[PDB]
């Protein structure tokens, strides 16, 4: 726990606050909690979501890493930032869906919660 963790949380503090939506504030909180809390991810359900939210032209960030343990998004571009995800999650969430990003990127982007999904 150190540098990567610190900067990122701090950055998405100057996101919620400078701009609007609470995401990028909430995400700070999750990280600012025990590791054995976050993520989880498993790209399954980072797809069809219990909530109406799911795939669409919007990202679905996850607080935590994303992992590949299932199918991938369909035709929709829906690809999202998260704290780093490795393995099939990444390079699988590619092509179909969209390309995953750093989430720092999700921090430099449109600030202000845009169409985004929690997708824990």
């Amino acid at each position: 726990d150190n540098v990567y963790l610190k900067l990122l949380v701090k950055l998405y503090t100057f996101l919620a606050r400078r701009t609007d939506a609470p995401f990028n504030k909430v995400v700070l909180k999750a990280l600012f909690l025990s590791k054995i809390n976050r993520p989880p991810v498993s790209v399954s359900r980072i797809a069809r979501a219990l909530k109406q939210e799911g795939a669409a032209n919007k990202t679905v960030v996850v607080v935590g890493t994303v992992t590949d343990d299932a199918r991938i998004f369909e035709f929709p571009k829906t690809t999202v930032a998260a704290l780093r995800f490795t393995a099939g999650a990444r390079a699988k969430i590619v092509k179909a869906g969209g390309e995953c990003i750093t989430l720092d990127q999700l921090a430099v982007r449109a600030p202000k919660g845009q169409n985004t999904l929690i997708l824990r």
């Binding site: 726990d1 150190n2 540098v3 990567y4």
Partner: protein
Amino acid sequence: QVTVHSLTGEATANALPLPAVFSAPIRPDIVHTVFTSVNKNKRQAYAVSEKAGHQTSAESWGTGRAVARIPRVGGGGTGRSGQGAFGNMCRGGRMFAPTKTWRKWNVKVNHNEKRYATASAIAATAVASLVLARGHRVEKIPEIPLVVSTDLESIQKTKEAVAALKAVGAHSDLLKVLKSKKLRAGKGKYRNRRWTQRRGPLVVYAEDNGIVKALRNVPGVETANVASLNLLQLAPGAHLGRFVIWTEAAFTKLD
């Protein structure tokens, strides 16, 4: 990318690649456990006599004279009961615990959480700021993986290393070494004596099978070989990016 330099210091072949475990995350936490642990496996073994403060013949007289049951007879007040405290309690002891020398002083580490902080260690090597953050001073603001050529293996005498350090720019670092042995005050004076035996860390030279003879002597430099580098040399005393030079052969283990 990495840029190779010849033993002239002029821009030379300037060829890459960098390794891929250079991209490593960098964890000083993980690094600190493994090599600090390594330090632990260095301490010598000693013990207390198996039967010290056990030869009895000490009994406690029962009640009568105001006394505490002990057993404390023999040689005046004493006993082997571990509790030999000031005042009314006597001395003599028993089980100071538990130290027996045969205890396999060692360490506990997982394999993965060992050479994961090896490829972190080397990782925060090539970096810039956390190169010169913990110590090391080099003019070269640019890339500091510090490759060389396969030659440099051959350089017999240091001086010539000295010429090619000044021309790299890193070389100020050796100027900023303890550049002398400093006795260390405090404990360690008695034990393994840190004493005068001390100096700042320096350059680190990584090479292939051989270790560079004409480099080892230097202000505070250590020499190692790719197949053998540990988490200690890289990241000396739980820190990160020591300055480092790699022959371009001993790219890295890369494996």
